[PDB]
Amino acid sequence: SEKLTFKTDLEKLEREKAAQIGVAIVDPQGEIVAGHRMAQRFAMCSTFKFPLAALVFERIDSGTERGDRKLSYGPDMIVEWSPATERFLASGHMTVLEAAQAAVQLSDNGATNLLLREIGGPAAMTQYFRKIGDSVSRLDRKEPEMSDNTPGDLRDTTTPIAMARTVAKVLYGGALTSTSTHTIERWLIGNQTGDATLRAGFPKDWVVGEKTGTCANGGRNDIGFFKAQERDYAVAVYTTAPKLSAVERDELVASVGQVITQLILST
Amino acid sequence: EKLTFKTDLEKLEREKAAQIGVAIVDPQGEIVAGHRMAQRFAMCSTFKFPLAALVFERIDSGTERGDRKLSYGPDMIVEWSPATERFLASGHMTVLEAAQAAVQLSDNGATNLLLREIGGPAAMTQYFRKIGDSVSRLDRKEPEMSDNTPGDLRDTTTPIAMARTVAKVLYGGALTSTSTHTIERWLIGNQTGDATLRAGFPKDWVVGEKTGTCANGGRNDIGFFKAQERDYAVAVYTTAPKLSAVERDELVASVGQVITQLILS
Ligand SMILES: *C(=O)[C@H]([C@@H](C)O)[C@@]1(C)CC(S[C@@H]2CN[C@H](C(=O)N(C)C)C2)=C(C(=O)O)N1
Ligand SMILES: *C(=O)[C@H]([C@@H](C)O)[C@@]1(C)CC(S[C@@H]2CN[C@H](C(=O)N(C)C)C2)=C(C(=O)O)N1
Ligand SMILES: [Ca+2]
Ligand SMILES: [Cl-]
Ligand SMILES: [Cl-]
Ligand SMILES: [Cl-]
Ligand SMILES: [Cl-]
Ligand SMILES: [Cl-]
Ligand SMILES: [Cl-]
């Protein structure tokens, strides 16, 4: 069957690249299309910044936050991979929406930590996961230490099926207003960090948006959505390949994208 | 201090085989300092900042909508169009998405999408005239407007004309308060200027700018800075055909340092 070919082709990639590949593909209601290691825990790393932006948009939607509110900070906000936070430092602030867009589209760690400071830290992120029906995903630490990805450490983890269903809830399940949903979809399409990962393995006519992550100890992840053959899907891909180079991990996730493509065009 | 400014720029020109045009003006357009300030230079991608101002004026005026979807096909992809490429499958970019990509990524396809909408180079030149700039002129779309053929007056500005245009947009009331603040934040958050002017400015200055890189050694940076609680508009245009690309970045950064010495004096 198409699902057997999907499993077999992912297992080939696992053997040949010394990797473990977690995938979940769901329809807009969260029904499983296909998956692999669906219930295995993986470090979230920067992929949680997409649910973080959804959390922020829900607060704007409910009138408990303003997108143009200025979030002041100083040099101690700057951590590794904080390009926008660095540029705005002299000005003294980033707005709520500026920080959320930098977190999603540049994977800006400082902007992420700026938002975590405002919402009540990792506990508030986890509370949001639980609220939208995700009993699995957990944020325990801020950036960058949440990405240390120690094998077997359950902090800062999700599973592919939990996160795919969280993506579907945000994009298709009514978690956000129509306007906020469309905005976050456009942010995912316009992401600047994913050119070499999943969307490099999907056909060029598919509409794709995603959020990448890179973890210590070989983690490389990509979560988001694709629209193919007049059908919408949510997808979460988590990989661990400790001996691959960084470029080789990009190619690994792109190869997963091609295996997904072969499945969808066979469905 | 003005003699030191001139002398240090001419040392850079001599040692780098370069021409350096600079103008610094106060918020009202009065000259603070300059060098070759009325010599014409190719504007290349720096015109994308006045283009975004024109777009904001039309949104301000009700003749454009910021969320209007601009459809396109792969024909609109030209060199250096990263956002346009990412949004291609979706089939559109909004007016505001395109404008922000033009300013902050120097996206050429997004720039051309906006030029398509306003009626092309003639309308952008008309906007320069409307804001009191009788010098700057757009003749072509991207990337051919950046050909920078020696002596060609097409697609040129002068440092003083463009510095005064920056001041008019940011400080002279060309845009509403809200739109002025937005375009200022876009310039601060620009992704392309880390190695040019702001690399040569002190780190507490609030700086925003728009870069350009042209054929035949053009390297430009225009924008604003707030230093010692005073606001300035600045335009730097340079031509250095024999430098490497990294050395042209270093050249503009060195001009930033010469500017810093003048301001602090
Ligand atoms: C998130 O996964 C990760 C956090 C935990 O640090 C983050 C921000 C790093 C990266 S890759 C990193 C950022 N850009 C650099 C780059 O492209 N190179 C090679 C210079 C490396 C990501 C990511 O999304 O891929 N997120
Ligand atoms: C604008 O001046 C120029 C247009 C006319 O092509 C443009 C878009 C090119 C560049 S530099 C180019 C884009 N990013 C590349 C880069 O930095 N590297 C290292 C590959 C080269 C600019 C610019 O603003 O600097 N604008
Ligand atoms: Ca076409
Ligand atoms: Cl500001
Ligand atoms: Cl909800
Ligand atoms: Cl980019
Ligand atoms: Cl002069
Ligand atoms: Cl003169
Ligand atoms: Cl869309």
Ligand SMILES: [Cl-]
């Ligand atoms: Cl960046």
